[PDB]
Amino acid sequence: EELRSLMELRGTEAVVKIKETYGDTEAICRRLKTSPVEGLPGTAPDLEKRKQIFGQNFIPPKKPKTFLQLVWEALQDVTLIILEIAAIISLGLSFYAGWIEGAAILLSVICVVLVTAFNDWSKEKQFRGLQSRIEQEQKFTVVRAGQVVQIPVAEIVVGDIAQIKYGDLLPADGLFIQGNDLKIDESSLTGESDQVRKSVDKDPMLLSGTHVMEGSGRMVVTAVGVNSQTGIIFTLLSVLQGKLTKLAVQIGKAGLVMSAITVIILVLYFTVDTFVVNKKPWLTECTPVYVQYFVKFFIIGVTVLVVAVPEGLPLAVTISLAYSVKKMMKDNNLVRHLDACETMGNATAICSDKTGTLTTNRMTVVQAYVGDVHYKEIPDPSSINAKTLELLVNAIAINSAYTTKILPPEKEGALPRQVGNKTECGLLGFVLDLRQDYEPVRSQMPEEKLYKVYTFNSVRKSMSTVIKMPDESFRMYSKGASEIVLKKCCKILSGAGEARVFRPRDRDEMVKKVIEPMACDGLRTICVAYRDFPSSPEPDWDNENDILNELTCICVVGIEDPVRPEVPEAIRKCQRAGITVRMVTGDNINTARAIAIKCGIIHPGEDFLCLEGKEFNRRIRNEKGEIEQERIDKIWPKLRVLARSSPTDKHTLVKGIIDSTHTEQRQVVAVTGDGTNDGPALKKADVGFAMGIAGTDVAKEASDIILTDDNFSSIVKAVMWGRNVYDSISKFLQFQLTVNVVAVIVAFTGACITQDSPLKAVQMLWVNLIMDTFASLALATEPPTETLLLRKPYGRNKPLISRTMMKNILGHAVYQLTLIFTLLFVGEKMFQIDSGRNAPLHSPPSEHYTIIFNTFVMMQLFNEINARKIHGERNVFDGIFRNPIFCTIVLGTFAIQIVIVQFGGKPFSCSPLQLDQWMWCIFIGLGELVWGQVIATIPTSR
Amino acid sequence: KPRIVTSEEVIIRESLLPVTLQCNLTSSSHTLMYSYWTRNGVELTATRKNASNMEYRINKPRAEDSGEYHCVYHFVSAPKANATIEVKAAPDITGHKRSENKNEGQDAMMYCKSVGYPHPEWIWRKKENGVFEEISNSSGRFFITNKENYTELSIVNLQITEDPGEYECNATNSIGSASVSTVLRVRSHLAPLWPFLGILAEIIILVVIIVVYE
Numbered sequence A: 001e002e003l004r005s006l007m008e009l010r011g012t013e014a015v016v017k018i019k020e021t022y023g024d025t026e027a028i029c030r031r032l033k034t035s036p037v038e039g040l041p042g043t044a045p046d047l048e049k050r051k052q053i054f055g056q057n058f059i060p061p062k063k064p065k066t067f068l069q070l071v072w073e074a075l076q077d078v079t080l081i082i083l084e085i086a087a088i089i090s091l092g093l094s095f096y097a098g099w100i101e102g103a104a105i106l107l108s109v110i111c112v113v114l115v116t117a118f119n120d121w122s123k124e125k126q127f128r129g130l131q132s133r134i135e136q137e138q139k140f141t142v143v144r145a146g147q148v149v150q151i152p153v154a155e156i157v158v159g160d161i162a163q164i165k166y167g168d169l170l171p172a173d174g175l176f177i178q179g180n181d182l183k184i185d186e187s188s189l190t191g192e193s194d195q196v197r198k199s200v201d202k203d204p205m206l207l208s209g210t211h212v213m214e215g216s217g218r219m220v221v222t223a224v225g226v227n228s229q230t231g232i233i234f235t236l237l238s239v240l241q242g243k244l245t246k247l248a249v250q251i252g253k254a255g256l257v258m259s260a261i262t263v264i265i266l267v268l269y270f271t272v273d274t275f276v277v278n279k280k281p282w283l284t285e286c287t288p289v290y291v292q293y294f295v296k297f298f299i300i301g302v303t304v305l306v307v308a309v310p311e312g313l314p315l316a317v318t319i320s321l322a323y324s325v326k327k328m329m330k331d332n333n334l335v336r337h338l339d340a341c342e343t344m345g346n347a348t349a350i351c352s353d354k355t356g357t358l359t360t361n362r363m364t365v366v367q368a369y370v371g372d373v374h375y376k377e378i379p380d381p382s383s384i385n386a387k388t389l390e391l392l393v394n395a396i397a398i399n400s401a402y403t404t405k406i407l408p409p410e411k412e413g414a415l416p417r418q419v420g421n422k423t424e425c426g427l428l429g430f431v432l433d434l435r436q437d438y439e440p441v442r443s444q445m446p447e448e449k450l451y452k453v454y455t456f457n458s459v460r461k462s463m464s465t466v467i468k469m470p471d472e473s474f475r476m477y478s479k480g481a482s483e484i485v486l487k488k489c490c491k492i493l494s495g496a497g498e499a500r501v502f503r504p505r506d507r508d509e510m511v512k513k514v515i516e517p518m519a520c521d522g523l524r525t526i527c528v529a530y531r532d533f534p535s536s537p538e539p540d541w542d543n544e545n546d547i548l549n550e551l552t553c554i555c556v557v558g559i560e561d562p563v564r565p566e567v568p569e570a571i572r573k574c575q576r577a578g579i580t581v582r583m584v585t586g587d588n589i590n591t592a593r594a595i596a597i598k599c600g601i602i603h604p605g606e607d608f609l610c611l612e613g614k615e616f617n618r619r620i621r622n623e624k625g626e627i628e629q630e631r632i633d634k635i636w637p638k639l640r641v642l643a644r645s646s647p648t649d650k651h652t653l654v655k656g657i658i659d660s661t662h663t664e665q666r667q668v669v670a671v672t673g674d675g676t677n678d679g680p681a682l683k684k685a686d687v688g689f690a691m692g693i694a695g696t697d698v699a700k701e702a703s704d705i706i707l708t709d710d711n712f713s714s715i716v717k718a719v720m721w722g723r724n725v726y727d728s729i730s731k732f733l734q735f736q737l738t739v740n741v742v743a744v745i746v747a748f749t750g751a752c753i754t755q756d757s758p759l760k761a762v763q764m765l766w767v768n769l770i771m772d773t774f775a776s777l778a779l780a781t782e783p784p785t786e787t788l789l790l791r792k793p794y795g796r797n798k799p800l801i802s803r804t805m806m807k808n809i810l811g812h813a814v815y816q817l818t819l820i821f822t823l824l825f826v827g828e829k830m831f832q833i834d835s836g837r838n839a840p841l842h843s844p845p846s847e848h849y850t851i852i853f854n855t856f857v858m859m860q861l862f863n864e865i866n867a868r869k870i871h872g873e874r875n876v877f878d879g880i881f882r883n884p885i886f887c888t889i890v891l892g893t894f895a896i897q898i899v900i901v902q903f904g905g906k907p908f909s910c911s912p913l914q915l916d917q918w919m920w921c922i923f924i925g926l927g928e929l930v931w932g933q934v935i936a937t938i939p940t941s942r
Numbered sequence B: 001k002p003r004i005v006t007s008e009e010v011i012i013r014e015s016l017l018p019v020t021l022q023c024n025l026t027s028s029s030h031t032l033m034y035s036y037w038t039r040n041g042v043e044l045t046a047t048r049k050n051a052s053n054m055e056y057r058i059n060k061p062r063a064e065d066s067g068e069y070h071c072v073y074h075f076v077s078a079p080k081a082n083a084t085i086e087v088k089a090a091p092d093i094t095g096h097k098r099s100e101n102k103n104e105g106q107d108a109m110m111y112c113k114s115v116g117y118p119h120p121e122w123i124w125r126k127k128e129n130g131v132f133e134e135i136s137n138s139s140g141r142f143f144i145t146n147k148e149n150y151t152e153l154s155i156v157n158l159q160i161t162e163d164p165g166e167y168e169c170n171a172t173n174s175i176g177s178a179s180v181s182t183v184l185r186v187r188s189h190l191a192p193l194w195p196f197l198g199i200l201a202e203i204i205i206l207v208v209i210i211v212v213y214e
């Protein structure tokens, strides 16, 4: 509609445009068929109708690929094409049975392609599910039917009245009606980082994609979806994988060399025996049989190549993530960028924020200094002085914000709800605990009496109000952090309910008696003062520094937030796991250290620095006024607690730590900042956590991982998963390598001693499938155990294959090779089942090779279990049942193996076996586990 | 009675020289209709012509061509005159079972199909102590069937102490003789029990090690 051109005000043009079109904002509001600020009908048919025709959904499809293109891409492998053309040549050349081999090869190739395509499709579906949930998580507050409610961002439709608070992210283009101090940065669209102040009279335009900085208010959405000025730009528009792919290409080269050697050896042996030893000329009558022998040798070589080269190894890690992320959300770790899933595993330092993480963010009062009497416990109103409760309750009710109301508990026998400012809610809760109610006073106390209200600002560090109710006088009530207002107050009201003499002489005694014990106990101090201004002809209230002097302190209240019961154990575990945790906060140093000593960050009897922001900045800028890395290199290693720190100080600390060369191992840090100015600091770090319950959308937008419960322990959970991924890949690799060794050997020397390999094309394709795809789905998706936090973080230059894995691979390969060779050369005697050795062309399948194939597959199946442990744990069956996928895959493979050996003889080059032969094959399979238990006793260090 | 003069009998050796069989209708007062060759009573293909004298040319003599050839003479109003030329060579065994695996208590059979002429006489023997000994009917479980080209030996109610071994068929005739062998093995009934006990022992030792480790 015309609304598309109604945007891009950029000044005072669109205001006159709306004046010309409809006059004012209320006029377009009524025309919009939308209820004004009071509410909205919210009926489903009307909202859905205005969503279809009058609006646009926020549903970019991105068009994920389908199964057909996936299988088409999977079919594009070169080795499979070579196998296909070789099979076609062998099939056609049979007539110049034999077609069985070609048909079997074609069918097996098609089946392998289909299985790979299905696996890729399932993994992509898992990722899409995670993305759907991450989209669902978003929510914005609006008002409908006079009720403030939070709805998914995808649901907002033109006409909704949205409520804007500081730190929010605007989802749609709208119009400003009412609010206070609405200052927003629009640098994402205009490129200028200056806070534009919106007003009804000068700029009522609010644009999606911009970050609200200060103020609050309401807006009416006009443009949504692709019609917005931020969607036009869209419309007109790791460490482990490198090592994995390097190893893959090395193994591929080795396999190619081995295949070429085998083929040339077979060809040379055949031609020398046929023509040189036996005196036969180059007859043209027996050319087809010679070329058929050549094609058989080539097929053996191609199968050796197709098993030797590992395909999809660098894709292993992704698979693990696809089956881990959906479970990580159960630990309240909602991850946005997958690259940080494993990087957090290597993390060595964690920088934490006091409020929200370590505290419960609830205000509880324990001790108070009133009537010149200290009270370690809450005192009853009986023991109190004269007029102090009435005046104190009146001052608390008047001075505090009226909009913030403590809701009734209604929590089914739990703690009452807290709404508004935390400290203010704590004072109101204390007042209610003293058997006084501020509602009767506030109801009878109109806003006109408060002519002057100084809201808490960073510069003033106090919040106060003035009322002109007394005759020829005024009464002002102030609240401060007990340090700013302590200088202002010059009389003591706690003597007998009357003012006394307050001087700098007893200032020392009072501050020693009051501030020090609360600070040691970990309590921030709030002081309330009042004074009676005389009715001067014109008091100068603008200069609050001087006029707001000579106060009388009613009392002093110590307020604090309990530390969660889980943070001590989590911090101890993190310190055990080689990760050091530092604390950065804006509160004063005394309470910061008091909290840190309880949280276990800093030991009591140790020399850990606890310098504040001022000394930090001074030390790093002892030069002409710049920050150097060298000075930070002597401060960061032993810096634990930082106090009175601006966010830029946190950014400087993170930058100094992350790129330091002072230590031999590069540092990777995790910062959990949350705020409107915490953008660069959070972004600079490797992985940046954000808060979920109470967090600004700007902080969430630039964070890799969010915590849906704000608890510090959740961070620990991340570390666990960040390690588990790596371990998972490790173990999978182990298993595959073992197979890849034995197969190659069993086809090289088999083609050297005799003229054939014990395993044919279809059998070896099935072995490839079980060794790669089912192995990846079974071993690479395992649940983590809490023992993963008992080892130091891994370095960057760590070899991918550890010593224990190499020991396991070599030992199991040796056992398998010796047993298979014994069965191949001597197994005719043991079973009395004749010999399939030196079989002529198109020979019927013989039991002697079926036993070899079956025992090879059985050894692989029973060694897959033995490969679940990397660190030499003897209890191979520990925690096997926690992963149903592994058990399902192993049992399904075993059943399919039984079916393949018993039935489908000729196409698979197998022959039916009796119970005796199967029993010996399973006996060998279990002997594999016995040898795997035996090998663990070898010391790898020696 | 028509008079037919036939070529002399031929013995097929390994020599590569092709053989010609001749027959001439020297005396016949009947209007001839046709003439044609037979081997073992079977019509040879592409052999019907006027052919008052007929020549049959075999380019590649082998034992599988030796047979009782006739050149039959069919007249308009006279009985056919057949005559006979015999071609003989040493017998050649063409097919046999290389092994016979049967569980005790079942039936076993072994055959030695051959080609040649005269139809050889078959003798079965057992390889005992490195020599060949003639089989003994004894309990009567051995059924030996002989035919013009096919022979078979069948055993009922297989035991475990005499039946396993090696049996040879010897196939002798006037020109030569030819013999081949077959191996007979009988499986025990309680064979599967031993590997099951092995699996049980491995499970026992594995569980003992695991529980000791804890």
Ligand SMILES: *[C@@H]1O[C@H](CO)[C@@H](O)[C@H](O)[C@H]1NC(C)=O
Pocket (backbone or CB within 6 Å): B030, B031, B032, B033, B034, B035, B049, B050, B051, B052
């Ligand atoms: C062959 O032809 C001759 C001459 O006509 C005739 O006497 C003789 O019977 C024929 N033999 C056949 C048709 O078999």
Ligand SMILES: *[C@@H]1O[C@H](CO)[C@@H](O)[C@H](O)[C@H]1NC(C)=O
Pocket (backbone or CB within 6 Å): B005, B022, B023, B024, B053, B054
């Ligand atoms: C046999 O018949 C052939 C073919 O006609 C002839 O050449 C040959 O002389 C005949 N032999 C006798 C003995 O009649």
Ligand SMILES: *[C@@H]1O[C@H](CO)[C@@H](O)[C@H](O)[C@H]1NC(C)=O
Pocket (backbone or CB within 6 Å): B038, B041, B070, B072, B081, B082, B083
């Ligand atoms: C020809 O007839 C004689 C009559 O004694 C018979 O023995 C011979 O088998 C017959 N030939 C054929 C090929 O049937």
Ligand SMILES: *[C@@H]1O[C@H](CO)[C@@H](O)[C@H](O)[C@H]1NC(C)=O
Pocket (backbone or CB within 6 Å): B137, B139, B140, B141, B142, B143, B144
């Ligand atoms: C062996 O004796 C039995 C007795 O019934 C008989 O059936 C069988 O034919 C005999 N012959 C041979 C050659 O073993």
Ligand SMILES: *[C@@H]1O[C@H](CO)[C@@H](O)[C@H](O)[C@H]1NC(C)=O
Pocket (backbone or CB within 6 Å): B113, B114, B115, B148, B149, B150
């Ligand atoms: C044995 O002779 C018969 C005659 O009817 C024949 O059917 C069968 O094929 C022959 N078997 C051979 C030659 O192996």
Ligand SMILES: *[C@@H]1O[C@H](CO)[C@@H](O)[C@H](O)[C@H]1NC(C)=O
Pocket (backbone or CB within 6 Å): B170, B171, B172, B177, B178, B179
């Ligand atoms: C067959 O048996 C006869 C009589 O014992 C013997 O002379 C001959 O060598 C045997 N050999 C073959 C190969 O048939």
